[PDB]
Amino acid sequence: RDVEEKRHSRDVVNELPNPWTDYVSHALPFPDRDAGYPDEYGDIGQWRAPGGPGSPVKGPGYYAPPMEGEHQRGYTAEWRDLKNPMRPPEFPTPWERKYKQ
Amino acid sequence: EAQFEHLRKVYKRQWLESFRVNADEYIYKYNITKAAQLAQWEYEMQAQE
Amino acid sequence: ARAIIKRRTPQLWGAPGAPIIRMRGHHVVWKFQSYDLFVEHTHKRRNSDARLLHYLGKHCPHPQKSLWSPDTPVAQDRHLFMLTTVDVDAFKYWFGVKRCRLSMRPWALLAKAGLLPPSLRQNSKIMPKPIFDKEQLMRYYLANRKEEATIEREDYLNYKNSLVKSEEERAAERPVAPYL
Amino acid sequence: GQYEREAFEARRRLEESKNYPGPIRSATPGDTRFYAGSLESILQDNDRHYWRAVIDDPQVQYVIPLRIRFKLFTWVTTGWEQRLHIVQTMAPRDITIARLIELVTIENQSPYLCSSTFTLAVDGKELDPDKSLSDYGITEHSRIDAIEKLDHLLHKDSERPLDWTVDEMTTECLKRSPYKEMGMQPQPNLAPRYEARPKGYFGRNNYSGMKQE
Amino acid sequence: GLNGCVETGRSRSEVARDLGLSYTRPLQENEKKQLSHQALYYERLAKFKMEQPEAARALERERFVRKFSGMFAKMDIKSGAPDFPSTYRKLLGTKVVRWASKRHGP
Amino acid sequence: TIPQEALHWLLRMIVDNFNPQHVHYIAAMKTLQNAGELDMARDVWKIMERQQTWPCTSTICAYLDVCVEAGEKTWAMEAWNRYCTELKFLQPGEVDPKPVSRVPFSLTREELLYLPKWKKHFDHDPNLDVVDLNRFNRTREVYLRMAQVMLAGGERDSFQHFYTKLEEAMLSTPTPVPEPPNPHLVRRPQWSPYEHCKSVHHS
Amino acid sequence: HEALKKLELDPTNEKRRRFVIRQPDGTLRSAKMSEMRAWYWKEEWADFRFWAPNMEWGIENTPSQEQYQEHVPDTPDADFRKQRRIQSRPVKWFYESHYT
Amino acid sequence: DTDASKNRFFRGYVFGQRELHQLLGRPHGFEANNTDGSNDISAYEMTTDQRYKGIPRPAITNLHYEPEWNYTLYRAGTHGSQLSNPRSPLTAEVLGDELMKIRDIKSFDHCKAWFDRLQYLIKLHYDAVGDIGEFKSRHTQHVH
Amino acid sequence: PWWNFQTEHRQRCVMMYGGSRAKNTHNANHRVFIKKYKRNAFPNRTRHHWAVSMTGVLGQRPRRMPWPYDLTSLIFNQPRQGSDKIGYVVGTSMLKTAVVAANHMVYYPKFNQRVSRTSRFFAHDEDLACVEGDLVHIKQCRKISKYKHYYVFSILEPNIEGRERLKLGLKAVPPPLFGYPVSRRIVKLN
Amino acid sequence: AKRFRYNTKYPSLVSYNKLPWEILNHETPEFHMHVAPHYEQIMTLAASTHVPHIVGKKHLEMPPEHRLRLLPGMFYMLDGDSIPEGFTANRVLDPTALQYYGRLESLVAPVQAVRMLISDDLRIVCNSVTLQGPLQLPVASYASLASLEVVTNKASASFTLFHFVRPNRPPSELQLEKYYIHAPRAMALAEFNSTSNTSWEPKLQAPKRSKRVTPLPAYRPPQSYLMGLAERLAVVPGSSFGRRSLMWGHWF
Amino acid sequence: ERGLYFPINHRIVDRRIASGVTVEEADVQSRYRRELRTSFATGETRQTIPPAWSACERPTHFLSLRLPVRNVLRTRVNEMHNQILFSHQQHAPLLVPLEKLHITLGVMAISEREETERLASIYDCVSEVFSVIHPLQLRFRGLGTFGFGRVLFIRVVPEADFGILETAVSKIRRRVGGELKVDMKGNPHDSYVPHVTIAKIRSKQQTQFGSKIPISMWVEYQHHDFGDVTFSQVDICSMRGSKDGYYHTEGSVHL
Amino acid sequence: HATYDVAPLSHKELFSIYQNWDKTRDELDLLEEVEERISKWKLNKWEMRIPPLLTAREKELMRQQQELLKSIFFDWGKCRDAL
RNA sequence: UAAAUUAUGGUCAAUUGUUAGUAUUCAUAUUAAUUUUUUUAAAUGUUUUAUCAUUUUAUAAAGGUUUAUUUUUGAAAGAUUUUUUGUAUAAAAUUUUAGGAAUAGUUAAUAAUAAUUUAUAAUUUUGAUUAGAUUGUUUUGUUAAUGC
After folding, report:
1. J127 - beta bridge partners?
2. Which of I182, I97, I85 is nearest to I147 (CA)?
3. Which of B23, F87, G84, K251 is least buried, going by the fewest C-beta atoms within 10 A?
4. How far is the CA of G35 from the C1' of M142 (A)?
5. Do chains B and C touch, with touching meaning 3 or more CB–CB pairs less than 8 Å apart?
6. Across the E/K interface, how many CB contacts are shorter than 8 Å?
7. Do the Cβ atoms of D133 and E81 come closer than 8 Å?
8. CB atoms within 10 A of CB L19
9. Is the Cβ of H27 closer than 8 Å to some Cβ of chain I?
10. Beta strands D81-92 and K26-28: pairing type?
11. Interchain proximity C79–G24, CB inside 8 Å
């Protein structure tokens, strides 16, 4: 082992990663993404796509409160950043007219 | 079989120091998902009431 | 362990045997013979499934051409290719972590892969097996010695955990004033 | 032991505190009689077949499962053997050893073992039939032995069992306790078939805690 | 008490045990006498082994031979599949003529 | 084993869609402390936390030992800020080991029939049993490891604070009845007649 | 997983697919793009939008025993049955512009 | 796992939901206003508020209502793949210009080889018509 | 391969590019029925046999099939199918033993329709509460006898009429007026 | 090869595969095989420290009803041999039993005689081992045998050990192990405090050795037909002691 | 020859025996079909268990529903006593008299230094609960065991009015336990099992008569119907029956 | 945390309990020091606050009133953060 | 009870017979076959071991089954300086035949019980037991396709 390691470290071409030996890329049992497989109807992976109604839900990006939440009580941070159309933007951009419309 | 059993460990330093990272990441994503579907159940419970 | 043994097909011990990375492949006409590499146990039932663990790949014993790449003026690339599909990560989990026996033809392949060192039975017939003697073996270790403080590290990060949480960048996990 | 000692410590402290309300019995769950697995297994006294992650109250154990290590003459078909025969009796904490041995007498299902009146022991010194279990300190752990009226004679060779492997079974042996039933001459079915341990099982000499060979 | 639990898995009458309540119909005289008889078996054992340990021993002999005679002596699934005649259908008319039908229960 | 096999087995318990109880946390923190994988006994804290779980007194004590040994006061200050604050010493009048309270989660018929399938699901979340796993008041232990890590990191002032507050309660308040041993972490012995054993002179 | 070839052939993906070519001199090296693409099921691409593809099964693409049902000579001169007069055969894609 | 809102099989009035409603006292109707088969809710649920009946709030829900709390502990490539992406500055600084030059030497060799072969074929067939061998003359078509 | 045409076949060993390797079994064989009896001499009594059988299970036709999506899976989440079963407890006369009669789901793919089906179970009930009719929940366990793998896991409604019928003394349920269907004209007079 | 959990296979009313119950029998040399290497540790004990019940003054006197209530497990050493009451004594000269006491005698005063006593009840047997002469042990002044007046007196001290048990009883109720407390020899340290303290000069370093080790006689490889590689054969280096990967000293 | 081969009645695997022990070392033969017997097959009525201190002290005051005159429980109990006697002359000195009959809905360790003042506040809590309640009809059906067979009693069934009655008695338990820190036996939050003790083994008979009443004497009535009866009075009584037979009436509440 | 011995008070109970007599009790300063704390709280701090020692009736009305207050405090919390 | 598109989004459904007044899956077609063609098989002696012994090597002969076949580390993988643990038999869904009816070492509880314990027991027309054909639940063929 020692004499081989001496010659191996003497080899310049070495000291590079052999990604077959260096890591187990995905060691768990299941893929990191839905991969073309069927769906609830059997719509085989080609007849479908990910993100539709079959996905896990996306949840409300807020809180769901009872009675005195957003009904005229006050306002959240989503109430000062919103701007009326008449007054200009903070920072100037040269937006196209055509793309504006 | 000194190298052949030197590896049979190295591939427990490699298959676990990878299942560590990947179950960490699977839980960081299935946790966003677990939490979001849990939130939706709570919300549909509200609208049902 | 059986009253009337099965004669061509005894292995060493037991009914469900240890896992072994075999490389089977059905014997029909050579043109139609390619190898089902797969984890499995030693002591199987007659087919290759009932102690099949985990399909591991397929090998083409027939060296094929670069008809997927263009015609290079590069020799080693124009040479025939011999192709195989492994399951590198479930091989690491089986071999490394569950310790399945690595048979010799499959090893003959993975050696060529670069996973495992070239096997016992890739014998360069043309050079003799070694001559061990304690005087020279100890005289060398005497000559070139490596330290405990350089060996214990490698022992640890080569057989035990190796993600060194860099002491400096463990700072990113020690919180700040609102809770510090 | 780091469990028996400590659970006794706390079992004792619990009544070293009078400011303690009692247990909420609806919230102190029993054990389930129906479970997953296959068998009607018995777990401990403190254990539940389900998960009960609580550290429930360490309660006093009213009836002890007392284990008495009898001596059953077994018949491997190559001699008679001495082997451990524990009879684990569930016995209370208040009982006199006289009634405990009456109890074991009723409890056994092998009357190979309650033919003649016997007595108890712990690391040798007998227990009297007038005091009780805590009178010596009998837990479920008391490494108890049992001694028959003919235990001091079994090195001997007079009452020692007359086996058909090495001894003459007369006709009168063929109407006496084990031998009327033991089945000497093999029926078409070998009717009562017993164990069988080789004459060369252990090696040239018999079974000992220490290495002889 | 009319309900089990979910964590435990225990039944209606066992939570009624662990709270001390008595859910049980009026039992007919038959369900009464079968139960009184099942209530006295241990008094029978204590009055049996204690004053006729001869008969205790006699039935010891009877049962102790029987636990070795008979059909089976070890416990396999083949041995103790809890309904032999219907767990093994291929073996009831030819070999095992003990049972005359392949099925006796739900 | 490498040390990390607990950690792996905790996660693989998670990936298995399992609910790691606090005992699966105590165990998994002891076995990486023993091994001196403290960054790992921390990531067991963080796993317990990403789970959004309530470290019972035992578990706070556990992680606090970890902060002691690694010598980082910050690591422990947040466990203090988060969890082991509503822990109060046993005031002279109140009961010492307040009994286990939460009944076995049950349902009535109109609870089981009408309610959704996802409300009844009982995979034992460990935050359902803090009400009894903190029924035994390890507060003195907690305060003690607090003082420890304070000393370790070198805050004489806060260290004095914790030590002093703890000592006065020691002088004044009664003693909490210590817990009967963890029936699952530290293991009961099974009754084994040691007869057929390799005796003292066996070999 | 062919659905995700554009992932599994992208360097930034740590779960990238791994291919190795051990040359005949023992030196390990990593795949060529072409070999990577060989390992998936055949990928067709032809954007009819601005320039016609070289669609298969023409009169010219197909050979005899497929097109007609006899072997027919492949004369580069006077193939009347393909309504063809002569056929200079320069290299397939040499003279046409590249985008076509 | 799934429910009547997920599994298109669950809202089958013919035998599943019809008995569900004849049990739950709902008005079950063939082509009902509620998609499952229920015409409206039953007396029991109408009266009784169910939102916290049964079981508490599984407290990982906060992992949605709170983002700062959920994290992945160890970063991406730590388990050994930090040098997968050849051109990340991670790899560039780990290896360095000498090692990247070495590691791309073979690709440079491929292109240089194609160009050596091309330039020789050009020297050869560059005079386009003459003869070179025993019965081979210069064809441009090899170069092409 | 299957997708290839008879005369375009070459090699029955491999599949060149991809597809489905499978043995083209020969379904087209005219299975027959060899009459070994006479139309008036059959060694059966009830169901006579006179033409080929279609054999299998999960293969017979109409293709009945297992469907878990029923009342039970609408009410309870389960670890493994059949665990939880709700029914009219019918039959308890075996001391401490209940017979719970609860349904499953038999889906017919060809028709696109269902029929859930009946089954008299065995269900232990320690302490003898349930009476014939209490709508009960039944759960599975470790076995309890030859035939009872269940236990009465609750009541959902106790037959209060019945319980009072017993208390008063009568039979908690009158017994069926007639027996099983017979073939003999039993002439009951007076 | 590890230990399985439970008997799931057989009716436990007929004990089937159970390794049989060891019973030490006083008639045969097994009794002394077991009770023989135990005495030597109780000897090193009662030569290191004082333990109460060892050094009695005389027999125990108890009625024959309570004899078996205190004695079974009673083991003590008297100044000289004398049969306790209610017993008979049988000398033993069997060499196959005596052979064990070798390690007893070569560490303490050599053993003179050995007897087995049986009660008139037949049920309490006392293995009685009478020792003789100056002990080999540096018996400590605060021992129990030091109070036995043996090391006080000059040579020819005949003290005697007694161990009582019930007969036919396994090597479990032989309460002779509970005295396995190991206490060292401080007499050894007792040199550096009295009048040898100025006489003894200690050397801390090592001296300059200019001479290498003189090698052993040259190795003549074996000439018998060897069993084979004692590594591959699972045979401990001498079939006695060692590690099967520390396969030193098996022919090579 | 008349059943299964390896019956599940005897299929048992005890796990307070170590591992391997029954395999190859030792046999543990016992009778497990009595430690695996059910409260329905013995009679264990899970009485509210008092903790250490409250168990050391004797019942001083006890809430009890009074039986009216001309009962059905009284008459069926009378025939039960006739058959106890015609069965055994032994067992007459264990039965409770007919006049000591009551209905126990709670026992309470009261100190005499704060005796009558605490009795008054307790009376407030009792009347403030049983004021709006209607007269109570209950069911007596089938006996049970207190003290592990020491006490035999005709439990009131939960099948007529145990719901209302136990809302009441757990209210007054909470009140007497956590409001006015009196010692009811159990937790302030537990519900004491209302009971009608019909016989008992008392410490003054433990020595001669045992610590477990002989289940043969009474087990024919373990599941007998004793009757449904109506009652109007919840009384806190001090534990002295010898006053006029029925225990000292330290307070009554009519319904 | 809703440990044993802890139960939902009444108003008379609250008056008798939380009655200490100091006068430098600024309404708008004590209130802001309470409300900023409940804004720095995290959603587990609302977890263990139902005293387990209640019937099923009162426990659910307790969760009810509690998520009421909790919504209300989060409304005020977002209002105060926008403020 | 509102139209809407930032323009083909999520990847191919498609039926090819010369009949013979008319009603009706029904001769002649094509597809998969079988009838049909020798490019897949093949041999004997299992092998070690200290020895008349013992360690190692466990689902293809049939056997006729439709309420049916189910189970573990203790072997082995398998790593140390010693005594080291709690994971197994259970099930659950689906079961044929023209003319359809009775079947039986029995059902449950006790039980480490009862060849003579207790009992209003259990299987069945939601098609039982007998007998009959039949190998049981990701492999094909046809068809655009539920099917068959």
Report:
1. J116, J163
2. I97
3. G84
4. 40
5. yes
6. 64
7. no
8. 7
9. no
10. parallel
11. yes
What angle (nearest 5°) sits at the alpha carbon of residue D191, between those of residues D185 and D193? 90
Q: What are phi and psi of J111, to 5 degrees?
A: -75, 130
| Residue pair K215/E39 in contact by the 8 Å Cβ criterion | yes
Q: Which of F194, D112, G23, J240 is nearest to C66 (CA)?
A: G23
Q: Which chains touch I (3 or more CB pairs under 8 A)?
A: C, D, E, F, H, K
Nucleotide whose C1' lies closest to the alpha carbon of residue K20:
M74
Contact J177 F200 (CB under 8 A): yes
Angstrom distance (rounded) from CA J241 to CA D48 = 47
Q: Are E85 and E71 in contact (CB under 8 A)?
A: no
Q: Do K8 and I163 touch (CB under 8 A)?
A: no
- Total residue count of chain D as it appears in this document: 213
Taking CA atoms, E47 is separated from D115, D118, E56, in Å, by 17, 20, 10
* Location of structure tokens 């099965």: C6
Is D123's CB within 8 Å of J13's CB?
no
DSSP state of D187: P
Structure tokens of D144?
A: 């108890």
Which approach determined this entry? cryo-EM
Mapped onto helix, strand or coil, the DSSP state of residue K178 is: helix
Do E85 and E91 form a contact (C-beta atoms < 8 A)?
no
CA A67/CA L70 separation, integer angstroms: 11
Q: Which tokens belong to G52?
A: 């016609």
Q: What is the spatial distance between Cα F136 and Cα J99, in angstroms, rounded to a whole number? A: 61
CB-based contacts of F61, cutoff 8 Å, min separation 6 = F138, F141, F142, F145
Which stretches within chain J are classed as H helix? 30-48, 67-70, 95-98, 102-105
Q: Provide the 10 A C-beta neighbour count for residue K250.
A: 19
DSSP per-residue string spanning F101-145: -PPPPB--HHHHTTS-TTTS-----GGGSHHHHTSS--HHHHHHH
Q: Using an 8 Å Cβ cutoff, are I117 and I104 in contact?
A: yes
Tokens of F29: 């923190």
Q: Quick one: tokens of H119?
A: 């330039």
* Residue K240: both structure tokens together: 């002295």
- Interchain pair F198, D209: CB under 8 A: yes
Collapsing DSSP to helix, strand or coil, H36 comes out as coil
Reported resolution, Å: 3.5
- H or E element: which one contains C58? strand C52-59
**Residues near H69 by Cβ (< 8 Å), separated by ≥ 6?**
F49, F50, F52, H62, H63, L42
Give the chain C residue whose CA is nearest to the CA of G35: C68
**Chain B interface includes A58 (CB < 8 A):** yes
- Taking the C-alpha atoms of residue I115 and residue I103, their distance in angstroms, rounded to an integer, is 10
| Nearest C-alpha neighbor of F180 from the set D60, H89, I3, A19 | D60
CA distance D123 to D142: 9
Q: Is residue C59 within 8 Å of C81, Cβ to Cβ?
A: no
J10 shares contact with chain F (CB less than 8 Å):
no
CA within 13 Å, CB half, J67: 21
Provide the 10 A C-beta neighbour count for residue C46: 8
Q: Do chains I and B touch (3 or more CB pairs under 8 A)?
A: no
Q: State the Cα–Cα distance between residues J135 and H3, nearest whole angstrom.
A: 88
- DSSP letter, residue C171: G
Chain L positions touching A74 (Cβ under 8 A) are 75, 78-79, 82
Structure tokens at I4: 């290839």
Task: Using only the alpha carbons of chain D, give its radius of gyration.
Answer: 23
C-alpha–C-alpha distance, residues I80 and D146, integer Å: 49
- Asked whether the beta carbons of residue D191 and residue E8 sit closer than 8 angstroms, the reply is no
**What's the DSSP call for residue K21?**
I
E strands present in chain L: none
Q: How far is the CA of I4 from the C1' of M95 (A)?
A: 37
The number of residues making up chain F comes to 203
Spatial separation of the C-alpha atoms in residues J121 and J65, rounded to whole Å: 10
- The backbone region for C174, taken as left when phi is positive above 0, alpha when psi lies in -120 to 50, beta otherwise, is beta
